[PDB]
């Protein structure tokens, strides 16, 4: 387990605006099979190495890949406040998981 992940940290954002979620896995040459993006316990999106990006039907109208190797979550609501996760699925290293916290203001 030589790798680590740098995230967007802890960010605040205004209600009704956009936000960018980003993670970077450094310190390993491992295969990255798939990244799962979660809002708390709910699946937001997956980026699969072979088959690309797929957006959950619960977020298609406001979640878009990019910029970079992350997501843009639009039309923010106060209930979007909370934890966010970027779960890296790797070979042979295993499963690294990064955390972001987002607070939606007013």
């Amino acid at each position: 387990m030589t790798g680590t992940i740098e995230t967007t940290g802890n960010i605040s954002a205004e209600k009704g605006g956009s936000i960018i979620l980003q993670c970077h896995l450094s310190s390993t040459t491992a295969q990255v099979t798939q990244v799962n993006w979660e809002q708390q316990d709910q699946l937001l999106a997956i980026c699969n190495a072979d088959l690309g990006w797929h957006i959950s039907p619960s977020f298609k109208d406001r979640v878009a890949p990019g910029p970079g190797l992350g997501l843009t979550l639009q039309s923010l609501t106060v209930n979007d406040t909370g934890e966010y996760f970027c779960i890296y699925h790797t070979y042979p290293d295993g499963t690294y998981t990064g955390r972001i916290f987002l607070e939606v203001l007013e």
Partner: antibody
Framework: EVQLQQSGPGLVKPSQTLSLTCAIS??????????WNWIRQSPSRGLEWLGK?????????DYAVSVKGRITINPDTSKNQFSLQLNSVTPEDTAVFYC????????????????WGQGTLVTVSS | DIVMTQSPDSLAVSLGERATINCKSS????????????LAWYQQKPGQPPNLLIY???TRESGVPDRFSGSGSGTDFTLTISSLQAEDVAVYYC?????????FGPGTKVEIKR
């Protein structure tokens, strides 16, 4: 084709729990390219989606707001099935309940319902 | 939620004639990235579950006779039966699988005029 075989009692007393199982043949409940759904149909409300469970390196679920708090859909990997539990039923829950496979082969998180169970008529009555 | 409507509520067509039915979604279900329309059509006969006929708005499911076809824009859809057969009497539903919760139209009943 996939076969979906439903079982479970149809008659449920008001305020008690409905429990149905869908046994899968010809696919795996953990398949990366499917999601396992429950639908209900009644003369009053037509066809309505209730919930789904699916595995994308990890088990996920989604439930309709009209049953949130009362509904659980759990996979059983050893028996290759998935179940429905609906708590605190009222006569509004009387309907035909269907399990179905959602085929998510091109969009990994969305697709049509390509195979269906035979349906279980559920009657909420004392 | 997305609301699906259908028209007409019922139709009666002579044996061998063309039957067409309409569906509308209250928002677009065309996803620009893959250019797919997230729309399905089902057939349901009495006592049976719905049976998938068309998905991606215009792709016919395998085993479905080729007299069944679909087309549409991002919001308005049509299911056409080119030559109505006696065994085609049933209720036909459309359904979006674009956003949660997935939702169904109210159904159009298709009958034979004789």
């Amino acid at each position: 084709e996939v076969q979906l075989q439903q079982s479970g009692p149809g008659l449920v007393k008001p305020s008690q729990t409905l429990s149905l199982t869908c046994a899968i043949s010809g696919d795996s409940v953990s398949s990366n390219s499917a999601a396992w759904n429950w639908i209900r149909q009644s003369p009053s409300r037509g066809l309505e989606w209730l919930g789904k469970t699916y595995y994308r390196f990890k088990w996920y679920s989604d439930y309709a707001v009209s049953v949130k708090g009362r509904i659980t859909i759990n996979p059983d990997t050893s028996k290759n099935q998935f179940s429905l539990q609906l708590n605190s039923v009222t006569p509004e829950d009387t309907a035909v309940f269907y399990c179905t496979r959602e085929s998510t082969t091109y969009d990994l998180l969305a697709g049509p319902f390509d195979y269906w169970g035979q349906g279980t008529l559920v009657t909420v009555s004392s | 939620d997305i609301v699906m409507t259908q028209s007409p509520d019922s139709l009666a067509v002579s044996l061998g004639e063309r039957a067409t039915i309409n569906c509308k979604s209250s928002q677009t279900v065309l996803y620009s990235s893959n250019n797919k329309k997230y729309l399905a059509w089902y057939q349901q006969k009495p006592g049976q579950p719905p049976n998938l006929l068309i998905y991606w708005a215009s792709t016919r499911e395998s085993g479905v006779p080729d007299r069944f076809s679909g087309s549409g824009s991002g919001t308005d859809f049509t299911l056409t039966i080119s030559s109505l057969q006696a065994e085609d009497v049933a209720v036909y539903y459309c359904q979006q699988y674009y956003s949660t919760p997935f939702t169904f139209g109210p159904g159009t009943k298709v009958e034979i005029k004789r």
